[model samples]
Target: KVFGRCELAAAMKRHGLDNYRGYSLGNWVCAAKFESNFNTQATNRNTDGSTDYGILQINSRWWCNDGRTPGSRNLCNIPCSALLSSDITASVNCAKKIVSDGNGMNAWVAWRNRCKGTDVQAWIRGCRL
Candidate 1:
């Protein structure tokens, strides 16, 4: 399922992404827009044998226990499948962990390459957060 632009932003805000780990809602929303285009079922298999899943496109090697990624840390203590659901609570929670773990939003290349070190206010401009 594809989420509407501001719809996903609203959801992320509900999950406390706004100001999470010192990153504003714009940072999170911008990354999510590019990462998976707000598709709940999105999945990407990496060349290194890990997979990224759900709207956040969270990776399997560290955040989720997909039961197959080599040396998966499962730091989120969640099944990767949970990230695929329309309910994004698990994905948001895991992302919070990622940011808190010294990586911040830089953990996501989508954000690092595009949304980072920039004025992201435009990403959330029309949203009524």
Candidate 2:
């Protein structure tokens, strides 16, 4: 795990997420905080018998393959386990694709319920990036 939000912001910026697709850095940071608290190994079972994967909690129902499930849309063309890695390149890329699909972070329930339109300065507070 990262030492703090600063490290996460730096890492995300290094991965080209500073202002990705018109979304501010804080939007991503806040969403990740609520989704997984920056835990790369985080996973949560959803009510629909699917699971959320990784720091951004990409859903298995659409974004990634869970292996046990069939007929996943697999929009990111990656295994859900790929989202659980400390190296967040794949996760970031997939998240970008998801946002580009017009969901605009609203695809994440965490973002919808906790982050959207909220004051997210705390997500980037004291972070130089």
Candidate 3:
């Protein structure tokens, strides 16, 4: 699903992710913007031969099973396709699990590369949540 920034922010807040696992709402919104541009159907193949799934771009190497990827840990016990659906509940749950495992947003390369240390309040500027 394609979502505007406000829509995404509202959903994240509704999901109780505004301050989830010690990461701020800005962190989630900023990372999602850089990862999949709020498109739930987004997928990307990494140079390391693993695929990133859905809006948060969870990796097949450690989180979800992509079937085609060999040796995936499937830590989230969820199919990668589940993360690509318009309903984001599965993805959100998996993301929370990942963060709880101590990776925090560092699990996302996009978060590390683009959103880390960036001021992201503009991501939800007009959203009242």
RMSD to truth, every model: 1.1, 1.3, 1.2
For each candidate, the alpha-carbon lDDT, in order, equals: 0.89, 0.86, 0.89
Summarize candidate 1's per-residue lDDT along 13-40 as a digit string, tens digits: 9989999878888888889888998798
Write one digit per residue (lDDT tens) for candidate 2, span 1-129: 532678888888889887788888888899899999988889998887888888898889999999866676798999999999888888999999998897677888888899988987678988877
Q: TM-score for model 2?
A: 0.92
Residue pairs in collision within model 1? none
Best by TM-score: 1
After superposition, candidate 2 runs with Cα above 4 Å error: none
TM-score, candidate 3, is 0.93
Stretches > 4 Å off in candidate 1: none
Pairs that clash in candidate 2: none
The Cα error of candidate 1 at residue 75, in Å, is: 0.8
Give residue 81's lDDT in candidate 3 (0 to 100).
Answer: 97
| Reference-based TM-score, model 1 | 0.94
Model 3 misplacement above 4 A? none
